Design a binder for this molecule. Structure first.
Ligand code: GNP
Ligand code: KBF
Ligand code: MG
Length: 166
């Protein structure tokens, strides 16, 4: 089985770990022991082919920088998560990607933007802004929610597709 290391990036309150625990543990984060494994693992079939979906979540409310590059340098694809109610996350998506390029030493690398907390109600940045954000990079966009487990699998699965090419 192919091993895919996906580095999940997010602002802070967006809910990066939540999407991971939901896809991997089918549960909501914010109640697990951190630094236990450092990365998540999962076996699924995307695009009709069986591959290993290793979800690697990153820090959100810790201004992680030193380790931030570590995940990228060892990770293949990068899943960006933003909050519809937290416009602050919208600006985070671009600045974060810039960090991926420096470490990845490339331009077009496996990446996927996912609008977390979309099932809430208060969406500051309409889908137009989110969709246009991903288009600016040339990556697919998928709206999902770490609270309803809607699209969580899609967003994560989509990321693998880009990595498979690498
Ligand atoms: N309504 C809603 N709330 C969400 C969603 N995703 C995350 N949250 C909210 O996000 C909060 C948890 O975020 P967070 O502070 O990053 O928790 P953590 O990631 O476990 N800790 P840390 O940030 O230190 O890693 C909770 O208040 C949770 O309810 C979502 O899709 N919908
Ligand atoms: O460097 C790491 N560990 C020491 C050995 C064993 C695995 C490969 O190197 C290691 C680095 C990581 C970097 C980013 C995310 C998860 C990681 C998880 C890891 O286990
Ligand atoms: Mg967390």
């Amino acid at each position: 089985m192919t091993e895919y290391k996906l580095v999940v990036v997010g602002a802070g309150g967006v809910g990066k770990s939540a999407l991971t625990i939901q896809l991997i543990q089918n549960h909501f984060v914010d109640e697990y022991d951190p630094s236990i494994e450092d990365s998540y693992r999962k076996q699924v079939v995307i695009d009709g082919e069986t591959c290993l979906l290793d979800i690697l979540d990153t820090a959100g409310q810790e201004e992680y920088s030193a380790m931030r590059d570590q995940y990228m340098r060892t990770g293949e694809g990068f899943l960006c998560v933003f909050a519809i109610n937290n416009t602050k996350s919208f600006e985070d998506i671009h600045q974060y990607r810039e960090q991926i390029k420096r470490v990845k030493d490339s331009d077009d690398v496996p990446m996927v933007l996912v609008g977390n907390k979309c099932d809430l109600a208060a969406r500051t940045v309409e889908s137009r802004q989110a969709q246009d954000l991903a288009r600016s990079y040339g990556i697919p966009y998928i709206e999902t929610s770490a609270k309803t487990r809607q699209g969580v699998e899609d967003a994560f699965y989509t990321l693998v597709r880009e990595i498979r090419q690498h």
